Amino acid sequence: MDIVFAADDNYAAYLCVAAKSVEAAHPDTEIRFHVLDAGISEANRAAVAANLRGGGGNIRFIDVNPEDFAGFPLNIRHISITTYARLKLGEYIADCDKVLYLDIDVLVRDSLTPLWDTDLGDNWLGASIDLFVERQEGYKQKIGMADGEYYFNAGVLLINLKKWRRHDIFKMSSEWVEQYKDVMQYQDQDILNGLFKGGVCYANSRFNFMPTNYAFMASRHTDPLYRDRTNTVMPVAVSHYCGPAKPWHRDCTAWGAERFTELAGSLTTVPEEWRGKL
Ligand SMILES: O=c1ccn([C@@H]2O[C@H](COP(=O)(O)OP(=O)(O)O[C@H]3O[C@H](CO)[C@H](O)[C@H](O)[C@H]3F)[C@@H](O)[C@H]2O)c(=O)[nH]1
Numbered sequence: 001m002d003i004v005f006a007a008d009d010n011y012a013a014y015l016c017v018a019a020k021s022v023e024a025a026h027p028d029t030e031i032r033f034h035v036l037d038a039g040i041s042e043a044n045r046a047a048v049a050a051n052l053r054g055g056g057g058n059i060r061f062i063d064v065n066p067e068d069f070a071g072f073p074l075n076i077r078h079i080s081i082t083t084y085a086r087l088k089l090g091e092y093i094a095d096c097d098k099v100l101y102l103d104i105d106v107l108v109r110d111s112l113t114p115l116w117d118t119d120l121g122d123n124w125l126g127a128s129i130d131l132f133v134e135r136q137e138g139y140k141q142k143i144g145m146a147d148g149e150y151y152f153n154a155g156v157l158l159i160n161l162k163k164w165r166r167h168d169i170f171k172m173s174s175e176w177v178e179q180y181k182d183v184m185q186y187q188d189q190d191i192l193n194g195l196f197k198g199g200v201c202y203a204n205s206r207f208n209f210m211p212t213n214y215a216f217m218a219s220r221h222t223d224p225l226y227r228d229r230t231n232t233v234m235p236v237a238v239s240h241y242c243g244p245a246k247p248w249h250r251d252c253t254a255w256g257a258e259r260f261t262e263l264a265g266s267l268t269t270v271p272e273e274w275r276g277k278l
């Protein structure tokens with residue numbers, strides 16, 4: 001399967017740990033990593049590659065110009081501009097009709113095959129519902145969404161890349177931002193929801209288990225489909241630490257955070273400069 005990550009130099013060490021969690025969870029599947037590289041040093045790219053399977057033979061770094069998204073809002077402090085690179089995925093990857101995009105702050109705990117094998121049809125992508133945003137009464141509607149269209153989290157996305165390449169996603173994004181820039185609160189995540197609403201395949205929350213999913217253990221909707229997708233079917237396949245509290249920081253009380261340090265300690269090569277953040 002083809003996995004996509006996006007990272008700047010600041011997140012190179014975390015990218016490595018996340019990538020290894022993917023390999024660990026798929027002992028008999030070829031994992032081809034495609035990294036949207038917003039400025040990772042040569043040393044950090046070699047370090048990341050050195051810690052992956054085959055010495056990093058299955059990882060390709062794709063240079064992206066962070067300035068491309070300079071005009072887009074950047075209000076969330078823990079997030080850098082690289083968070084918008086995913087919008088040009090159709091321009092960055094030519095060899096894949098389907099890719100599975102993951103944020104850096106994820107820890108894969110179970111096989112992603114069921115998600116990967118999902119047929120997207122003519123939908124733009126497959127994603128899990130964001131309970132945090134869905135319970136933010138009235139927000140969804142601020143960005144033009146209907147009550148029956150569920151707001152998804154942009155941290156785990158099965159992308160119908162073949163469909164994306166038939167359109168100019170960046171232009172559509174810039175136009176959407178121009179229309180909603182004064183109300184959007186979630187940056188790239190708002191854009192994706194706004195552009196693809198009505199053309200989203202919903203995956204079970206086991207593939208994007210965030211703090212709110214954990215706390216959830218009253219549904220915002222009675223819709224049986226909504227309930228089916230938001231009820232996580234155990235075991236958790238993907239832990240996603242969205243928000244300012246990350247597993248690589250101090251006193252992370254988020255569930256499953258200890259697997260991060262456990263993976264970091266299993267790293268083959270750890271540069272002196274990674275000792276701090278890991
Ligand atoms: O120093 C940084 C900070 C962020 N990033 C990138 O930006 C993504 C953006 O942020 P988080 O994963 O920390 O975002 P968060 O999960 O808290 O936020 C929700 O809203 C975000 C909005 O911009 C993203 O869409 C994200 O996918 C979604 F889950 C990271 O995965 C990473 O690829 C870097 O490369 N370096």
Ligand SMILES: OC[C@@H]1C[C@H](O)[C@@H](O)[C@H](O[C@H]2[C@H](O)[C@@H](O)[C@H](O)O[C@@H]2CO)O1
Nearest residue numbers: 076130132133153186211212242243244
């Ligand atoms: O859609 C989730 C949303 C994305 C946003 O970018 C991120 O900063 C944010 O964090 C939440 C987190 O999901 C909650 O569990 C926590 O209680 O609050 C933070 C906001 O400070 O999540």
Ligand SMILES: [Mn+2]
Nearest residue numbers: 103105155242
């Ligand atoms: Mn995230």
